[PDB]
Symmetry: C2
C-alpha cells in the first residue's frame, strides 16, 4: 500500500459524507471534521478548474486520475494524485455518489544535487510551434514539482535559465534541421530548467518533433526528459527557497529577443523534398507492394469490422 485516504461526496450538494480514518494520518484532519463540508473547500484555488473539468467530463451520463493540491489541517497545501469513481447510492431520479481516493505525491530526490542513474524518472513534456506546453507525463510531477495543470498553458521558454537562452536557440535550430527527416531525434547536452521551488536542475533531453506532411509546418516539439542532476533543494514542492535575480536591461531585453527568434524559426516551414521518383525501386519492388496490400487488409478488417 501507500498512505492514502478515500472520501465519499454527494453529487447532489457536493458535501463530503465519509472519510476513511487514514485522513488524520495523511492530512492531519480529525476523523470526522470534513463531514458536511463542501469538498472543493479543500482544493486549492489554482486547481479547482482542473477538478471541475474532471468530474464534468467523467460523470456517467482506469477511471479519471489527476492531481490537485489539498490543504492540511491547522498554511500549507500538499500534492495529491486523486482517483475518482462514480457509483450509485447505497443503504436506504438517481442519487449519485462520488468516491475520491487521494494518495500523496512526494519529491523524487533523497539528497541535494543528486546525480541520477537507472532509477531515474523519465518523462515527456510536449509543446506547440509557438512554445506552449500542451502535455506533461505523470513522472514530471515528482521531478519538477509542477502539477500538469501548472505547466500546460505556459511557455516552455519561462523555464530556461536566462544565461542559457542562446544555447537553447541552437538546440532548437538543430530540432528544426532534424525535422527534414521524420522521427529524426537527438540528445543534447544537459541544461538548466526552472522547477517549482525556484531552483534549477540539469535535464538531459532527447528531442523529437512532428511536422504536418501536408502543410509542412511544425505542429509540436516533444522533449523526452531525464534529470541529469537534481536541485539544491530536495523538496520540490515547498515555497520558493532563495535563488533569484537578473540584470534588467541587457537581460530581459536580450532574452525576450532570443525567444522571439526561436518561435520565429519554429514557425518556419520545413523541407520534405520530392526525392521519390528514383524511388520507383520500391514503386516496382514486389516486396513493398505485397506488404502494403496486406497492410491494407490488416486494417480494413480490424477498425471498421470490429
Amino acid at each position: 500500500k501507500e498512505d492514502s485516504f478515500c472520501c465519499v461526496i454527494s453529487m447532489h450538494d457536493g458535501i463530503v459524507l465519509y472519510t476513511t480514518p487514514s485522513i488524520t494520518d495523511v492530512l492531519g484532519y480529525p476523523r470526522d471534521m470534513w463531514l458536511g463540508r463542501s469538498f472543493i473547500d479543500f482544493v486549492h484555488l489554482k486547481d479547482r478548474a482542473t477538478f471541475a473539468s474532471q468530474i464534468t467530463t467523467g460523470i456517467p451520463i482506469a477511471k479519471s486520475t489527476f492531481c490537485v493540491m489539498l490543504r492540511r489541517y491547522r498554511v500549507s497545501y500538499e500534492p495529491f494524485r486523486l482517483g475518482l469513481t462514480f457509483r450509485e447510492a447505497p443503504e436506504e431520479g438517481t442519487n449519485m455518489l462520488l468516491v475520491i481516493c487521494a494518495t500523496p505525491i512526494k519529491s523524487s530526490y533523497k539528497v541535494p544535487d543528486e546525480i541520477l542513474s537507472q532509477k531515474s524518472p523519465k518523462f515527456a513534456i510536449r509543446h506547440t510551434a509557438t512554445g506552449i506546453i500542451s502535455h506533461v507525463d505523470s513522472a514530471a510531477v515528482s521531478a519538477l514539482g509542477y502539477l500538469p495543470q501548472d505547466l500546460i498553458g505556459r511557455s516552455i521558454m519561462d523555464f530556461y535559465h536566462h544565461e542559457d537562452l542562446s544555447v537553447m536557440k541552437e538546440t532548437y535550430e538543430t530540432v528544426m534541421k532534424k525535422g527534414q527527416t521524420a522521427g529524426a531525434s537527438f540528445c543534447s547536452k544537459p541544461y538548466r530548467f526552472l522547477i517549482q521551488n525556484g531552483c534549477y536542475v540539469l535535464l538531459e533531453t532527447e528531442w523529437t518533433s512532428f511536422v504536418n506532411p501536408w502543410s509542412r509546418k511544425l505542429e509540436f516539439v516533444v522533449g523526452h526528459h531525464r534529470v541529469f542532476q537534481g536541485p539544491k533543494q530536495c523538496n520540490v514542492f515547498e515555497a520558493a527557497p532563495t535563488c533569484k535575480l537578473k540584470i534588467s536591461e541587457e537581460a530581459q531585453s536580450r532574452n525576450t529577443r532570443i525567444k522571439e527568434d526561436i518561435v520565429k524559426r519554429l514557425a518556419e516551414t520545413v523541407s520534405r523534398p520530392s526525392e521519390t521518383v528514383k524511388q520507383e525501386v520500391s514503386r516496382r519492388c514486389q516486396a513493398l507492394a505485397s506488404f502494403m496490400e496486406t497492410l491494407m487488409d490488416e486494417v480494413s478488417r480490424a477498425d471498421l469490422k470490429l
Copy 2:
C-alpha cells in the same frame, strides 16, 4: 462487408503510395490516379481542420467522418479508419530517422431513410446530443450523422438553438424550463413531445427526446444538457446529405427578432443557479459512518 477503399499515405510528404482497386467503384477515381498525389486535396475544406487534428493527436484506433470528392463537383460523406504503421525499414537502397506510414480505409456513409416522412420503428435512428449551459453543441453520437445529415464537426460549436423550427421556440422554452425544474433532482429525466429539428438538407424531422442534465453540485450552475433523441418522423427528402431546394421562407421583425429574443430567455434561464436544499443535517452525516464505510469497503476489493 460494405463498399470501401483503402489508401496508404506517406507521413513524410503526405502523398499517397498505395490504393485498393475498389477506389474506382467507390469514389470513381481511375485505379492509380490517386498515386503520387497529396491526400488532403480530396478532403473537403470544412473537414481539413478535423482531419489535421485527428492525425496530429493520434500520431479501436482513431475513427471519424470527413467529406471526399468524387471523380467528375460533388462530395460524399465517409467514415475513415486511421492506422499508423511503421514503413518497413528500406532494404538498404535509399534513406539513412524512421519513416511512418498512414493507412486509411474509407467506407461511405448513407442516409438513414428509405422513404419520405418515415414513421417510427425499432430501425429508426437513436442518438444522443449534448450542449452546454449556453447552448453550444459539444458532443454528437455517430448515429446522428445518417439521421440529420451533419458530420460532427458541422455540429460541434454551433448553437443548439439554431436548429429548432422558428415556430417552436415558445414550446422549446417550456421544455427547457422543465429541464431546469428537473435539474433540482440529480439524474431526473422526462420525455418531451416530438419537435422539429433542422437537418443538413433544409428539411425538418420529428425528434422525440428524453432530456437529462448535469448541474455542478458545487457552483449550483447547469453544466450541460444531454438529449436522447429518436427520429419520430423522417425528412420529406430521403437523402439528408444533398441540400434540397424545396424548403425555405424568412419573415423578419416579429419573427427574426421576436424569435432571436426568445433564444435569450431560454439561454438566460439555463444560466440561473439551481437550488439543491437539504432536509438532512448535522449528525445525520455521522449516523452513516458504518453504512458508508461498509459501502467503501466493497468498493475496495474491486
